[PDB]
Symmetry: D2
């Protein structure tokens, strides 16, 4: 059992054709996570949008929020004794093998898993330094002189240790460094063939919109449609999808094989 947390501290704005929250929600769903806590300021508006999630075969809970690590304190009782995963509300991911990348991370039963991605702008993120042999040797939160161009993405997989590490503090980078110092941090490369886009500024929200529109209008498939992912995980049956351009798309999913 692994439980999910989305921290939305903007995430109700659409990226092209659906609310921004649908991307991190879809990401946790693709990783096989069904029990998800949405932490925000906005909490009632997410409740109004997403409900308890039983329409999508999910169990959605809500909590209200001083730092990203604070999510483990707020969701401590939600996490209980289970493995956890944390996603940030303003990140979207796209690529081939993304189901498998998440699967591998979510299936480790010990330590923590994070993803390093080559960016132009590493100073804006957690930066991970590698030695000559490609081993992760240091983490720095928004460094003035980055040790590498490899930014840690807003996607984190944690074992039962995280709550107690967070308690002894609030930077997510300190949590991740505590695992690294114990030799229990897995840093997987997210290859340049994957797209990890910021949706956090006026410019990047626009770029992300154009990016999704180009893929979707080319393929005739949607990126990060939660009802599709639910259906393909077999968390909802054809009857439930039937009940649930977006409506037309869901109908098409019942009458087409997509590989």
């Amino acid at each position: 059992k692994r439980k999910g947390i989305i921290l939305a501290g903007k995430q109700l704005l659409p990226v092209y054709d659906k609310p921004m929250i649908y991307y991190p929600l879809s990401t946790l769903m693709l990783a096989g996570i069904r029990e998800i806590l949405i932490i925000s300021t906005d909490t009632p508006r997410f409740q109004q949008l997403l409900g308890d999630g039983s329409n999508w075969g999910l169990d959605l809970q809500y909590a209200v929020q001083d730092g990203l690590a604070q999510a483990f304190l707020i969701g401590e009782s939600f996490i209980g004794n289970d493995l956890s995963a944390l996603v940030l509300g303003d990140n979207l991911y796209y690529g081939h093998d993304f189901h498998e990348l998440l699967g591998s991370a979510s299936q480790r039963q010990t330590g923590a898993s994070v993803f390093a991605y080559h960016v132009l702008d590493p100073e804006r993120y957690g930066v991970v330094e590698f030695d000559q042999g490609g081993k992760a040797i240091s983490l720095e939160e928004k460094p003035l002189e980055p040790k590498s161009n490899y930014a840690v993405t807003g996607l984190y997989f944690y074992d039962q240790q995280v709550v107690d590490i967070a308690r002894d503090l609030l930077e997510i980078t300190d949590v991740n460094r505590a695992y690294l110092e114990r030799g229990q941090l897995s840093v997987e490369i997210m290859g340049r063939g994957y797209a990890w886009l910021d949706t956090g500024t006026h410019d990047s929200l626009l770029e992300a919109g154009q990016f999704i529109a180009t893929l979707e209008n080319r393929q005739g498939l949607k990126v990060a449609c939660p009802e599709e992912i639910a259906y393909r995980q077999k968390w909802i049956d054809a009857a439930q999808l039937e009940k649930l351009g977006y409506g037309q798309y869901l109908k098409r999913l019942l009458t087409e094989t997509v590989y």
Copy 2:
């Protein structure tokens, strides 16, 4: 040995410069299919184009020895079909395995090196890629049975059997030249159907996680440009930079990259010498 062919066929936007010489954002369109053949490990490449455009590719790309490639050039007298590439490049292909790419196609995704590697390493039959599109009527369409086996190909069908379009990327064994010779426009789809009829066609799915973009219209060239710019300005890495791929294949050494970087894109090539990229 597998040998590569890039077919760059043929207003008023393109009256001063053929389509595959137009830039997609920051580099000439030909750099994408060129980079694709290079990523598949192909170094000996024939560029077929119009009598007018062949000299301009020669002027842009040279013999390719700067990038550790062997580039040759041939002309297509008139646009009498895509299969005509095997007739024109028959002597270039000889008795070797071959690969055909179309000049106006752009590919991007994780495991693309591995997808190409697998196809290029088969020593028999033909390998093509099926991609889910909104607009299947514009392409070769591949129909699948309940067990996911390919059962038919149709060139630009009025009523497509599926949404799975065959991409502009083709891997062929020694049979292709003789199959092409016996065809009666000469369609690549007829070549592929001849393999399918012999049970020697491998149709690999190119997953929705890969981007296969058209660069063939004013609208799609613009979309493709915005797509590459977004990735490149996010990553600080280039898509389909031939000098990078050459360097990473170890077809050129750091000394050769330095020389190529000096006169120029140039700043980017210099950065490649002083950074580990996984």
Copy 3:
């Protein structure tokens, strides 16, 4: 008579969305009523423009061609085109500039109809250091070529209207267009008209701006069902070519959206 010069120092043969970049500055000179135009470019690019545009008689224009041996400055255009200009009023446009807005015919008309001094356009930009910057007291008091500390955010556009003085001013320079314009300013014969924020003046000179310019034109054109800076349209509306000539020009492009567009111009009133 006012004679036009397009300096394209290749970039101006690249398309902005649906037509070659040169069609924008060409259309701009045409909208200003200029029919006799000299296209100055490199020895390599001059033949390619000749191949694209011809003598221009298809569009009721008289196009001539000259070469710039090496890129020794923008003012060099008046030395190269000295004989082409002769004793006539002149206009200079740069090959990588795109203009769009309401009253652009009237803005150009007014400038082209002055029979004395020089007329330039000041446009509020985020990035003034990249251009000639004009300082105001609303009277223009100074010009600086790509200043490190700009006196204002008002950039001088790539669009210049000159009287018979320009050739002799250019002859005595040591070669910046800004020095030419300052020589007029020093004589109190420089007219600096504001190009309002309601007009779009876009750079097409980098990978990023060429893309932005492309998206900009596509959005207008697909919204309106009208083209921006289509030379055959402007020629037809100036009555430099008749319906018969437009029909002939449309026929061979019949295949595509551009031929179809020219045919539509014969059977529709557009205000």
Copy 4:
């Protein structure tokens, strides 16, 4: 002249750097209108109230009412009273040189109605206006199957004291035809040099966003910033702009210390 914005949520979505409602709001403000009624759904009316307030921060008087497009004159009948009126739709964006003067001219007629005709690829989606050989408007059709022209009537309407009673007796096109039938409809051409964009679909909202970003990042000026328009109309002084300003804040500060023509 009193203004009505009908926003029938979509008009709270941003076009690049500001809420969509800021464009039609800025349009009424540029036309010199300070008293504006925002009509929306029972659900969205409170959200506009929360965003915009009574508008006194921007030297405006903003009122709110809840909800065909002609129904706006019935709902805002008491708001309009005996005054001239102007109606804008919540999902339309306008840009061009002389837009202050185009609006000024329309807003300054003291009789009949003024609308704007714009050449579009897609006339069937709008009110279509037909012209005779002499450029006179001879007919209006609401979303015709066979459009008589490519000239769409924009979401921008100027009305005299007659409109409430015409509406009482529900398509905006019928209201406009009633004026046309009385020979009291002025149809001004909005030239191709102006941009009139739809922000009503996923595709057009994206296009509109890219369009505004390109202009704004080129000029270092904002399109349809209400605080700027208020300041330039002298409805608020430098002191009030300073308070409101305390990238968008930085922009308002810049407006106090720069001459912009």
